[PDB]
Amino acid sequence: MMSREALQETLSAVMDNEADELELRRVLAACGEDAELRSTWSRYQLARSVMHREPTLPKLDIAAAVSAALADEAAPPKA
Amino acid sequence: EQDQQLVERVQRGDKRAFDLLVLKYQHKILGLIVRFVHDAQEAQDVAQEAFIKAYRALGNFRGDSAFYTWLYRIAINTAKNHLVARGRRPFEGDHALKDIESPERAMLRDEIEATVHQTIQQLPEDLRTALTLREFEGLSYEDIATVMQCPVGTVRSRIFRAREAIDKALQPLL
Ligand SMILES: NC(=O)c1cccnc1
Question: In CATH, what number does B95-174 get?
């Protein structure tokens, strides 16, 4: 199994579009079920925005509510 | 396409990939919306509405434009329709945010910005160089590996270690 550290590294690769296909599937499955992994992704992206002097609103979140609303929708269409 | 890998999964029906894109872009979308509505709770509501509208429109996302551009345009449409329907209530620089956002949030952002830049300043050069070539020069891991004369796996690990050092400094602040 992938350790938490290994999955955080996969998130880092995904941020750069460098992940392999299998680890991409696994890290997404793990994010669906693990709040701390989603928060790591959230904080990695916050730091990238800070580095680039882009808008940040630390600790403000609407993603949880969006996700809960989208749980009640059909999955998005396949291309 | 800055989000190519998550976009690929979204176009295969992956809700988890969309959730990660919401996490990545929610602050930019909130910051855009607040310029329109000038109210903190209203901005959150309309930003949430924009993301759900984008989700429901993914059938029309062909991948011809960047995901963020497609999302941005939907947020603009959402904010416009919101304002036109609402009517009169019963945009430059940081004016809107400074007036509306929590003063505690601006203090935290000040701390976070100083901490990020101090952590990067203190990184070993191999970490800071790999991160800068990725984040500010846009180089792929392969092209960074060529520039730094190391294996591509070493680039991947160096960038990860740089982000982990930044993250460990930010975790207590968040
Ligand atoms: N509560 C806030 O600080 C805030 C900032 C921007 C939009 N909505 C809310």
Answer: 1.10.10.10
What is the CATH number that goes with domain B1-94? 1.10.1740.10
Q: Which atom of ligand 1 is nearest to the CA of B102?
A: 3
3-state class percentages of chain A: helix first, strand second, coil last, to nearest 5:
65, 0, 35
DSSP assignment of B62-91 equals -SSS-HHHHHHHHHHHHHHHHHHHH-S---
Contacts of A71 (CB under 8 A, 6+ apart): B15
Q: CB neighbours of B148 closer than 8 A, spacing ≥ 6?
A: B126, B129, B130, B133, B155
State if residue A57 touches ligand 1 by the CB under 6 angstroms criterion: yes
CB contact under 8 A, B108 and A60: no
Q: Atom 9, ligand 1: which residue's CA is nearest?
A: B40
Closest C-alpha to ligand 1, atom 7: B40
Tell me the resolution in Å: 2.0
